[PDB]
RNA sequence: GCGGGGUGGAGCAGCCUGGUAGCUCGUCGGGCUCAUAACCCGAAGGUCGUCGGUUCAAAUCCGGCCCCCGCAACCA
RNA sequence: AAAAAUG
RNA sequence: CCGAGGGUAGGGCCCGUGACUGGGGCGAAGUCGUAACAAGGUAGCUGUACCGGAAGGUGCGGCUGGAU
RNA sequence: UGGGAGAGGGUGGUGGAAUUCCCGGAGUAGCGGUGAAAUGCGCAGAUACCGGGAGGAACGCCGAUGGCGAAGGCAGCCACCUGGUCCACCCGUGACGCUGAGGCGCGAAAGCGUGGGGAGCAAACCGGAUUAGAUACCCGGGUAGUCCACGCCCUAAACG
RNA sequence: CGAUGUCGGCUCGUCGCAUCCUGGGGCUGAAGAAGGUCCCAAGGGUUGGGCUGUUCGCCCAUUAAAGCGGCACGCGAGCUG
RNA sequence: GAAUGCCGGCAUGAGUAACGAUAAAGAGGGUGAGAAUCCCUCUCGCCGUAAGCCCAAGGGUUCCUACGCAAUGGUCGUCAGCGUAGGGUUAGGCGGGACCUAAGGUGAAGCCGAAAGGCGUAGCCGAAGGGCAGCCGGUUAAUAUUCCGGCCCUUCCCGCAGGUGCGAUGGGGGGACGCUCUAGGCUAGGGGGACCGGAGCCAUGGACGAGCCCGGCCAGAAGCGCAGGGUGGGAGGUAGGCAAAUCCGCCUCCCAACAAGCUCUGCGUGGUGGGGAAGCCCGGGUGACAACCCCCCGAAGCCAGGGAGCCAAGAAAAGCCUCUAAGCACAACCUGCGGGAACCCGUACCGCAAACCGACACAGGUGGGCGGGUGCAAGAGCACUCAGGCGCGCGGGAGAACCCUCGCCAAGGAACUCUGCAAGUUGGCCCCGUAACUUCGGGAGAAGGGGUGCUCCCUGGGGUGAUGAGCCCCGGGGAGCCGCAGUGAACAGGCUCUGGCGACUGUUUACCAAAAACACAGCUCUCUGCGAACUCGUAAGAGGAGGUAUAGGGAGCGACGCUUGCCCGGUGCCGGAAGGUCAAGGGGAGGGGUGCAAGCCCCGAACCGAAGCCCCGGUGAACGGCGGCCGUAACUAUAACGGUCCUAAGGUAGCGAAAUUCCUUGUCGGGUAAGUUCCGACCUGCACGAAAAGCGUAACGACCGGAGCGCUGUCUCGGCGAGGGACCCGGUGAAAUUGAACUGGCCGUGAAGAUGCGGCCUACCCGUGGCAGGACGAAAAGACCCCGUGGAGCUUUACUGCAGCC
RNA sequence: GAGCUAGCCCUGGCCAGGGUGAAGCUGGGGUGAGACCCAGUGGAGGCCCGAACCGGUGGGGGAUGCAAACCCCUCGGAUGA
RNA sequence: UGGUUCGUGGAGCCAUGGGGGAAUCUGGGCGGACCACCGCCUAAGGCUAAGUACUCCGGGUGACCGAUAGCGCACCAGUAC
């Protein structure tokens, strides 16, 4: 349900931001959040690995707890929903009967005040987290851990979902949001229905001002920089490329494949993703 | 306008001081070397 | 200044490796039609831009001249 | 289950 | 004070006009094709859409004002 | 008031047949296609046949000169929400009606916007044949679209 | 080439005669007026705009005429750029 | 004797430029050997969101006093930031440390690396962040929130009394936070007062006045009051907060809920203690028993952790509180009272500058706070001015040219010129009114007009208060007065039409380019399933990311609109268990050396053997590419058609003499009196063209063209005037350059442009102010050009390598 | 050697005054219900004018300068990248 | 791969990162591929003075310098700057 506006400014336009409707607490839990640390794109040696980063608004990382098995069959409240600017799906407080408090990623669909509960026999119901091998086959499931007891690796963005398409053996096929078709231990938890705050791709930014207040710098082209710096940079005015597309440091950037040949987890992945 | 030297008695310090010539072998180095000249001071000064 | 070309009426192979000029259309004569085209059967026409030389022999190899395209003519 | 223009 | 009117500024409508351009109308006998009237030799038409030297061809759907 | 019929509409869920692709087995000189061919496909193992999988679309027989709606339009099956309409009884209100310039809404197909989806078919396109030519009719491929959601476009031989 | 600043314009001029004007002539297919061609002559004069960086040139409006060239394509220790 | 040689010395220029802002000076009186420059007084000018005052950094005795003037000071010098000597910096409460943590750094554990060393959880260091107890007044030549005076406050130790399960580096709470707007109530600060206190004053026509002028406060414990912040209370259950736990969390019940209460601040009051002017008299004394009150304006500051809204979603640890564990309950903690203790370092001075950074007493640069009054709509804007601080460390004359900066101008008004460069015009507020086009906001302050001062009368509302007066804040109508002109000075847009480019605000070549370049949202391709891909690193380790395909890296295009055609032959990438090729290695047909021999040793064919390559296909928002000649229509002209050679395929849409057009000022049209530029068209596009995107687009632009109005010294075409220089005298006194000089013109000659040679002419010796033709004038061993088997940066299918990858 | 310059991380500070008036909200109208319209309140923005502050567009002066990048007029951004 | 004069050369010998991996004297290495003969020497543990190298320090001596020379410094120098 995102929000436009009457373009009173030429950069006011186009912008668009989210309706933030499912929010309903405006200030995070105390207890679960630790400072988050700005690295700048740069590593301990202080040199840039990553360009163009750093410079956005300070954030609170606000802890998730990845592995629901941790508390197994101990059910607990949806205290609420928070916004957490870490990543792009929002957040669920929930509050155990036991007492204990913790975020997990906000679902599609989950509302606020209704039991979620994690275990081998904790009913098939939008929130609760199950192990792979007892999910029905087919359903919605996010949040899934890639190996057993890792944490939760997959499908944690906006509105992503993995869906469920046969047992082999001790693994589970999932159909990845990539399209990648990946067998799963079946002993990996996972948490079914799909992740909220499905309208994020929608998000018009609506000027550079927002590109620098979420940390990404600006990106300079190649060909606008030097031979020194950069393959498709110097020429005469402007010119093309004159060489296959290739990256600052010179591999090629046109469908290069560079996905480790010998890896063992290509036993375990079963088509390549989609389009 | 504003020129290339603008003193502060910290960064100094930590920057040339004696201390921070210990903690490499290049600076080590360049203690023995001053030594030997003789030169009368090893570190710049300063008051802090 | 450098490069390529000129051959039946048109557009092109043959020139590189000398001896024999070929392909499509067109033109002509004759067939089918009421008649035209289409289609079928036959036929005609080129001394190879020009001149000179080499050679037993020049479209063909080597020189000069004419013309037709094409490229270059930069540092000041 | 229709090869083929025009005057 | 009002005031014919004169001056300055900005608008509204109408008419004439213009390099050029758009199609259109007619003009005894030009050029190229043959889409329609026979099942016109691919049934025709139509709304729309893309493409084509041109009439028109094709796609989705619709009518019979289509023959056998 | 009491009952009947119906592909009338909307949401969710669901079944089998077939096509295409992927994997497994088995098998060998062609398959495919046309008026006849050729492009295409096939020893790098196709077609044909078996088993398994993924996915989208459309609902055979019933089925009809049939039924429903104001129109466009609507067809597997299950449920839920819901409109229109006919018969019966003669109960109730007592002319409360008919049409309807504007206005508002719905409105096949194609088309558009943002996301989704994409088996089969298939404009534009490429190629093969026919031909004087063939930017066609026919064959081999093939993208938008066709499908879902929301929002536009509102045209017609929307015709009885 | 251990430097001779390179177009054009402005400013400031000065010189040459193969004279555009004015002055003095010969001839004329010179009736007059007005021209045509050559000869003598450099004293003075030789306009203002449009376009273009322009020189040059074209065009507008005049004019007795709207001359051609030299002086490091005069002149940047004078300027513009 | 030369090397633009090296070191040093002294000349030349030259008594010439300059004396470091045009804010400005004059006189008198001291002192002194000497005075424009030192001191005192009066007069004058300049800053006053400073050029004033207080902090921080930096500087390091420059502060105060006395005695001195050789040098330092752009002159002088008695003076000074200079010389000599003496004196000067006082803290439990300000700042820092004995507290805490952030980046980062260091780093028991542990990991890595030939050595040196590189990482790294905890821990530790790390501050202008958190935490923390002092305000006012006096006093010294110089220090003060530091000494002193008054009134307050903290911690530590010991002792006592009261209370309680005391106890921690372990648990929890709190600490604890963004941006924009903002209520209420105070304070700072400010304005007026016929009220209060005051030494005086009556001028020159008037005024003994409700006159003039000065001043009318500061701090302050408990208590009190006003204004706010914060926090619900009890009981039960508990499996969580890595032991325990009454605490915290979670559930259930009970009472309370804009409250109240309890608690913490802020302000007012408050015993009391200080301050307290003009003027006059010689920093002090009086003024003075000083007075110390009322009204209004009022914060961005305080209450504060207030309130609401918003997306980008907004530090950690300690102090503080609570919970309990060992331990221990003769204790220990808390509260109160009493007595005792309370350490180190900094305090001077400058501090938008003459003491800091700029080689200088340099027109530059330097973070935070206060920054008054009136008027102009407001304000930190502009002008004037208080407190306070200065006239910028050479002057005095003269009144030429010329330059700077500034003012004015007849008639004309872009004729200037590459261009209206520059300078004019416009200018603030109120009101009327306002176009195309558009993405509906805009364009728009579009454009274009009118009002604007002062006086008398009448009159609406708001704040404070009380509802009124007073003071204050917004207006309305009428009647009039003066001037050339009423935002009467200063600060304060010229406008319009039409093109190219780029969507836009933005960014850059610090120090000649601010653009049309970069960036930007937005589109597409493409890579990556997690110990990701990619990057840095030998590694360990990091970043990516405490992210997970709605995410992340890479590439191009660059809002948005309408669109993005054809070619996969070559190159790139992707796919392809066949075949071909292929190194090590396996293999060992078969030969060789040698030994009498068992043997030892070497060569060695077919065949088995990965990637890669060949080969098959795919692929354009991957690198790239998208034809020639010839004929033909009932005038001509041109070809809708046709013929033909070739290519992987032959440029579609849209545009087009363009930021691209050679021939070119193509041709026609517009505009102009005249238009090589500009605008509209035409198309034979030398050589546009579709993501090095194609065509357009409202808005935006110190971008770049063309036009018009308005106004002008730009120009015709110059003139006058002002000030700072230039000139003269006194003081101080450089420079690059320089073979030596006694250095004229012409006509020739000469290495081909002569003061220096020949001939001829002219010309007494030496300067001062000016002008720039020459000395191939100065400056820089030409940067264009070639030369060197000179160098460097960059490119690729140049050569050979190395990382990296297979 | 990052005390100049460039980028980032940690922690603080700064941006007078005025103008425009998005969404939302309340009221009214509207319809079967809605969309929507109107006025009010509201105070959004890489919004506007303009000091500080950050810049350095055009012109002039300066050129052994006050200055090895300054001075004057003018000009851009100034709640945001 | 390194060392040696030995740059793959017929390339031993010494040393060694990888692989495979003996024997205790009838064992084992070398004499420049390799073979036989003939000789030499006994690897995979360690220590060892003197002869040799240098001159901050002390002295002696110069067909060494004599204040631009001689160390950068004869002097308050690795100072002033
Ligand atoms: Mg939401
Ligand atoms: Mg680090
Ligand atoms: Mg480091
Ligand atoms: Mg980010
Ligand atoms: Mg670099
Ligand atoms: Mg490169
Ligand atoms: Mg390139
Ligand atoms: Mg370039
Ligand atoms: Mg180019
Ligand atoms: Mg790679
Ligand atoms: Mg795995
Ligand atoms: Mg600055
Ligand atoms: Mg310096
Ligand atoms: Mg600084
Ligand atoms: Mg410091
Ligand atoms: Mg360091
Ligand atoms: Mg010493
Ligand atoms: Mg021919
Ligand atoms: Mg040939
Ligand atoms: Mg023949
Ligand atoms: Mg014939
Ligand atoms: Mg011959
Ligand atoms: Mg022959
Ligand atoms: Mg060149
Ligand atoms: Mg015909
Ligand atoms: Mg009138
Ligand atoms: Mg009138
Ligand atoms: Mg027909
Ligand atoms: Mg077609
Ligand atoms: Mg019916
Ligand atoms: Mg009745
Ligand atoms: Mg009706
Ligand atoms: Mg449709
Ligand atoms: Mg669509
Ligand atoms: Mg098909
Ligand atoms: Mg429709
Ligand atoms: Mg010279
Ligand atoms: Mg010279
Ligand atoms: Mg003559
Ligand atoms: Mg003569
Ligand atoms: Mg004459
Ligand atoms: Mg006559
Ligand atoms: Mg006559
Ligand atoms: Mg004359
Ligand atoms: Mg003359
Ligand atoms: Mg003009
Ligand atoms: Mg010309
Ligand atoms: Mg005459
Ligand atoms: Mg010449
Ligand atoms: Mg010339
Ligand atoms: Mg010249
Ligand atoms: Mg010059
Ligand atoms: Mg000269
Ligand atoms: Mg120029
Ligand atoms: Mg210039
Ligand atoms: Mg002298
Ligand atoms: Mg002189
Ligand atoms: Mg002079
Ligand atoms: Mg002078
Ligand atoms: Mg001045
Ligand atoms: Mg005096
Ligand atoms: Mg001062
Ligand atoms: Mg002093
Ligand atoms: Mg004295
Ligand atoms: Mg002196
Ligand atoms: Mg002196
Ligand atoms: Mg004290
Ligand atoms: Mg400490
Ligand atoms: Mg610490
Ligand atoms: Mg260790
Ligand atoms: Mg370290
Ligand atoms: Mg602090
Ligand atoms: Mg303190
Ligand atoms: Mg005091
Ligand atoms: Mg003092
Ligand atoms: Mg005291
Ligand atoms: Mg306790
Ligand atoms: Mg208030
Ligand atoms: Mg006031
Ligand atoms: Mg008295
Ligand atoms: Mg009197
Ligand atoms: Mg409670
Ligand atoms: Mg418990
Ligand atoms: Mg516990
Ligand atoms: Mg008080
Ligand atoms: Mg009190
Ligand atoms: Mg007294
Ligand atoms: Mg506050
Ligand atoms: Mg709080
Ligand atoms: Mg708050
Ligand atoms: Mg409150
Ligand atoms: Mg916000
Ligand atoms: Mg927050
Ligand atoms: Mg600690
Ligand atoms: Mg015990
Ligand atoms: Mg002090
Ligand atoms: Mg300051
Ligand atoms: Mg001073
Ligand atoms: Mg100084
Ligand atoms: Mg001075
Ligand atoms: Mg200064
Ligand atoms: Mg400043
Ligand atoms: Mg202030
Ligand atoms: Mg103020
Ligand atoms: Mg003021
Ligand atoms: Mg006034
Ligand atoms: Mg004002
Ligand atoms: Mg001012
Ligand atoms: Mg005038
Ligand atoms: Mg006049
Ligand atoms: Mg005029
Ligand atoms: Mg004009
Ligand atoms: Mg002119
Ligand atoms: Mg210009
Ligand atoms: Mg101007
Ligand atoms: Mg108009
Ligand atoms: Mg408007
Ligand atoms: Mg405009
Ligand atoms: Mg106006
Ligand atoms: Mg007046
Ligand atoms: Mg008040
Ligand atoms: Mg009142
Ligand atoms: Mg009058
Ligand atoms: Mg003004
Ligand atoms: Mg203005
Ligand atoms: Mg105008
Ligand atoms: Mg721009
Ligand atoms: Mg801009
Ligand atoms: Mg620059
Ligand atoms: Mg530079
Ligand atoms: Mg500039
Ligand atoms: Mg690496
Ligand atoms: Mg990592
Ligand atoms: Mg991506
Ligand atoms: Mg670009
Ligand atoms: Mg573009
Ligand atoms: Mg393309
Ligand atoms: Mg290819
Ligand atoms: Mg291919
Ligand atoms: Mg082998
Ligand atoms: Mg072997
Ligand atoms: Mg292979
Ligand atoms: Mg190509
Ligand atoms: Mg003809
Ligand atoms: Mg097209
Ligand atoms: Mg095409
Ligand atoms: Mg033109
Ligand atoms: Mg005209
Ligand atoms: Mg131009
Ligand atoms: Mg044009
Ligand atoms: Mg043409
Ligand atoms: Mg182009
Ligand atoms: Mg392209
Ligand atoms: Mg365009
Ligand atoms: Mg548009
Ligand atoms: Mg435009
Ligand atoms: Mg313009
Ligand atoms: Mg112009
Ligand atoms: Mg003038
Ligand atoms: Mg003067
Ligand atoms: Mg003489
Ligand atoms: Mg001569
Ligand atoms: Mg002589
Ligand atoms: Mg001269
Ligand atoms: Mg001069
Ligand atoms: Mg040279
Ligand atoms: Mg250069
Ligand atoms: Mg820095
Ligand atoms: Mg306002
Ligand atoms: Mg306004
Ligand atoms: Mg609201
Ligand atoms: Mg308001
Ligand atoms: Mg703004
Ligand atoms: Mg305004
Ligand atoms: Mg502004
Ligand atoms: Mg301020
Ligand atoms: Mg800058
Ligand atoms: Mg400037
Ligand atoms: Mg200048
Ligand atoms: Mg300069
Ligand atoms: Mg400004
Ligand atoms: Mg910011
Ligand atoms: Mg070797
Ligand atoms: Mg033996
Ligand atoms: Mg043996
Ligand atoms: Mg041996
Ligand atoms: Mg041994
Ligand atoms: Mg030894
Ligand atoms: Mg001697
Ligand atoms: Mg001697
Ligand atoms: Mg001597
Ligand atoms: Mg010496
Ligand atoms: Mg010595
Ligand atoms: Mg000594
Ligand atoms: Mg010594």
């Known amino acids: ?13 186009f912008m668009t931001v989210a309706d933030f409707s499912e929010i309903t607490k405006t200030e995070p839990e105390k207890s679960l959040v630790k400072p988050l640390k700005k690295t700048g794109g740069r590593n301990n040696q202080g040199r840039i690995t990553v360009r163009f980063r750093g410079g956005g608004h300070k954030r609170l990382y606000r802890i998730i707890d990845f592995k629901r098995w941790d508390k197994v069959g101990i059910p607990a409240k949806v205290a609420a929903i928070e916004y957490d600017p870490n990543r792009s799906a929002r957040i669920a407080l ?14 599609d669909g989950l509302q606020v005040g209704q039991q979620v509960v994690a275990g081998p026999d904790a009913p098939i119901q939008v929130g609760n987290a199950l192990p792979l091998r007892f999910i029905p086959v087919g359903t919605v499931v996010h949040a ?11 499908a944690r963005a906006a509105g992503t979902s993995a869906q469920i398409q046969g047992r082999e053996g001790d693994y589970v096929i999932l159909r990845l949001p990539s399209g990648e078709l990946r067998k799963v ?30 940390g990404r710098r600006p990106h300079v082209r190649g060909a606008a920089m030097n031979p020194v710096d950069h393959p498709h940079g110097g020429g005469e005015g402007r010119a093309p490329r004159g060489r296959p597309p290739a990256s600052p440091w ?26 | 306008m504003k020129r290339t030297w603008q003193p502060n008695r910290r960064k100094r310090a930590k920057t040339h001081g004696f201390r921070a010539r210990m903690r490499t ?3 080590r180095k360049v203690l023995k070397r001053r030594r030997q000249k003789g030169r009368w001071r090893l570190t710049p000064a300063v008051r802090k």
């Open chain 1, 250 to 275: 010179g591999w090629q950037t046109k469908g290069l494949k560079t996905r480790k040949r010998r890896k063992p987890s290509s036993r375990f992945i079963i088509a390549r993703r989609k389009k």
């Open chain 1, 185 to 214: 231990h079946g002993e990996c938890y996972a948490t079914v229905g799909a992740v909220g705050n499905a309208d994020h791709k929608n998000i018009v930014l609506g000027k550079a001002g927002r590109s620098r207040w979420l």
């Open chain 1, 1 to 13: 349900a995102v929000k436009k506006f009457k373009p009173y400014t030429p950069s006011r336009r």
């Open chain 2, 25 to 27: 072998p290049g600076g």
């Open chain 1, 94 to 107: 929930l509050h155990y009967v036991d007492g204990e408090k913790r975020y997990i990623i906000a679902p």
């Open chain 1, 144 to 154: 899934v851990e890639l190996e057993p007891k890792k944490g939760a690796k997959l």
